[PDB]
Amino acid sequence: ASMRFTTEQIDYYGKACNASEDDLVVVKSYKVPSSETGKCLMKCMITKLGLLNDDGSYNKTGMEAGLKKYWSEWSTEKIESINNKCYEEALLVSKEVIATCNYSYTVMACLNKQLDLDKST
Amino acid sequence: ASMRFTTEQIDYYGKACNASEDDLVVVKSYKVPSSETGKCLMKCMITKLGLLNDDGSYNKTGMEAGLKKYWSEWSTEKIESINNKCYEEALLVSKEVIATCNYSYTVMACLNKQLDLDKST
């Protein structure tokens, strides 16, 4: 289990976020694109999904709703537990950090770690 | 379609390649780790899968065999077409480029672009 994005999602939010195809295939290769647009793609995508607020901060209720909508395979129990843990880590971040395009990857790393660790039933 | 790795593959080849969990969750978040070991993880993994030679260069027959093994939902015809194209691109790359850790991501990106252009098979 991981926070996988499908080809369809990548293609849709790639249009929404003005990515090139080269940006998109680099994302799908597990890498952050080097273009100006491509390095902010992830932020743009997960904001449009409601996982982040427009200021870039973790949105607790939006994250839950998005996980339930698109990553329901994780189970509601694990979703609630992981979301509480990652939100709690989010509280400790500065405004400066949240402003960057990289913060999105930080959040996703947290969700992926906690998914690797969570034992909720 | 993309050259997706499963959570189990990432875990296995993470052990094989001496990655830390923080490295692995950054890969699963679609980012290259900045650690010395982590930034080489992809290379190490796809070398162990036989897609690259031990010297880092593209292995035509090993790529075809890995495609057929690990991504067997794709037709032989699609596999051979993406392999031929991305091998042809590989022939133009220097020894200095193949020596890098990042070249692996470039190979993955080429395969991912050719996958996006051959969905009818």
Author numbering:
A (entry chain A), B (entry chain B): 1 to 121
Q: What did the paper state?
A:
There is good evidence that aphids, like other insects, use OBPs to transport semiochemicals across the lymph into the sensilla on their antennae and deliver the signals to the ORs, where a behavioural response is initiated. The OBP3s from both aphid species have a similar structure to other classical OBPs i.e. six α-helices connected by extended loops, with three disulphide bridges formed by the six conserved cysteine residues between Cys17-Cys44; Cys40-Cys101 and Cys86-Cys110. The two OBPs also have some unique structural features which are different from other classical OBPs. There is a significant groove in the surface of the aphid OBP3s (indicated by an arrow in Fig. 2) formed primarily from the N-terminal region of the chains and parts of helices α1 and α2. No significant internal binding pockets were predicted by CASTp37 or SURFNET38 for both MvicOBP3 and NribOBP3.
In the two molecules of the asymmetric unit of MvicOBP3, each chain partially occupies the other’s groove, with Tyr30 inserted deep into the groove, forming an inter-chain hydrogen bond with the N of Phe5 in the other chain. The N-terminal residues of the other chain cover the second face of the groove and these symmetrical groove interactions form the centre of the monomer-monomer interface. The two molecules are related by very close to a twofold rotation of 179.4 degrees. PISA predicts that an interface of this size is biologically relevant rather than being a purely crystal packing interface. The interface generates a pocket, which assessed by CASTp25 has a volume of 390 Å3. However, it also binds to β-pinene, (−)-α-pinene and (+)-limonene so this one OBP could be responsible for transporting all four components of the alarm pheromone blend of this aphid. The MD results of MvicOBP3 showed that Tyr30 is displaced towards the protein. The most likely explanation is that Tyr30 is involved in the crystal packing/dimerisation in MvicOBP3 and is relaxing towards its probable monomeric conformation more like that seen in NribOBP3. MvicOBP3 is in an open conformation (Tyr30 away from the pocket) because of the interaction with another monomer.
